[PDB]
Amino acid sequence: PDREKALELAVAQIEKSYGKGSVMRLGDEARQPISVIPTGSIALDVALGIGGLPRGRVIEIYGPESSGKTTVALHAVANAQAAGGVAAFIDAEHALDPDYAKKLGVDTDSLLVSQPDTGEQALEIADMLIRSGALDIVVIDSVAALVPRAELEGEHVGLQARLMSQALRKMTGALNNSGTTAIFINQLRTGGKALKFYASVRMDVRRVETLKDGTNAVGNRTRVKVVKNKCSPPFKQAEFDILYGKGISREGSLIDMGVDQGLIRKSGAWFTYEGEQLGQGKENARNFLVENADVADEIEKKIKEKLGIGA
Structure with a gap:
């Protein structure tokens, strides 16, 4: 009645000028993409609205230590591989357990791994991998560990933020052309500022309680809030169980x-x-x-x- 029409007009223009997802009603249904990367939990797949993680976008997964955020990222790697995709893991933490990864379903033998000397080297290597067009998914572990060269050479500035900003600006284009998904793992409190705005999806991961069975605890209940989602309405949450040694x-x-x-x-x-x-x-x-x-x-x-x- 001339009111809903003007709103739909405005919405359509915003959407044309800034991209689908620029504005949504929280009650809307998501439109379904051709393919996504499932997460390993149907609850999380539903909370994301499109049934899994989007392709060609930046994803941030963050939370405290031992929240399960790495486990979520390894299931995404597993599922991408299981559908004939190639995965790379860019590691500045040196914490990866490949036996654990293998139990989740990761093909560790085919997993590409890089352990770079500097933050810039990590992002540049990520960039060259994405531009190949051969990768379905790359995980960077982690944002806090990406130390700038100047700092490692001992020569102050807040230039980890500038490093992420430049890298993400270059990387966003390559991801959209290639169909590659990049997952950044982040801790809870420098370069997370840019990540907040470039990411299409941001997930907050927390341990909720210990899963007991008798005297011994067999795992953890984990909660994920999707605090940012450009592909479907944000602010949904999901709970699911991570079993010690088995995964989600x-x-x-x-x-x-x-x-x-x-x-x-x-x-x-x-x-x-x-x-x-x-x-x-x-x-x-x-x-x-x-x-x-x-x-x-x-x-x-x-x-x-x-x-x-x-x-």
Whole structure:
């Protein structure tokens, strides 16, 4: 009625001049891209709106030490590889555990790794890799470790911020042309300032509580808030379980999202699906689903149909 029309006009112009995603209603549905990189948890895939991480964009994952942020990034690497993609890992922390990575699903033998001497070398190497057009995904671990050459040579300025700014300006173009996704891992408190604005997605990762089973703790409940999202409405959160030595529990998230969506009924201790019992307690239901890969797949598909998550 002349009011909604003027708004839609304004929206359309903003969108034309600054890009799709420049303005959104929080209640909007995301439009579905051709391909995305799934994260390993359907809860997180849903919270991102497009069913996984976007291609050709910068992603920032941040949070305290031992929050699980590296685990999330390694599942993204696993899934990209599993679909025939190539991955590179740019490492200034020297903390990577390849045995752990291997259990998550990473093909470590094919993983490209660089351990550069300086912050500028790290970003320039990242840049040359992206411009090849041969990479699906590169992870930089981490932003805080990217020390500028001047500092390493011992010659003050706030020039780590200037280094990120220049690098990100050059890198954003190459990513969009190439279809490559870059994940930057960051700690919680210099160069994060530019990252905040260049990133299309920003995820805040936190440990919520320890998952106990008897005397020993078997993992952690992890919460992720998507504080920035240019591809779908921001501010959604997801919870999921990271099991020690195993990574993100795919099956656990299928159960949680299963009950949430009313596809899996829960008597009390009993978990039910389509007139059959999955198990008594989350852990039995979880194990039932790992042992029965076919019913896990079916529940996944039905949740993705019910929410409109494309292929």
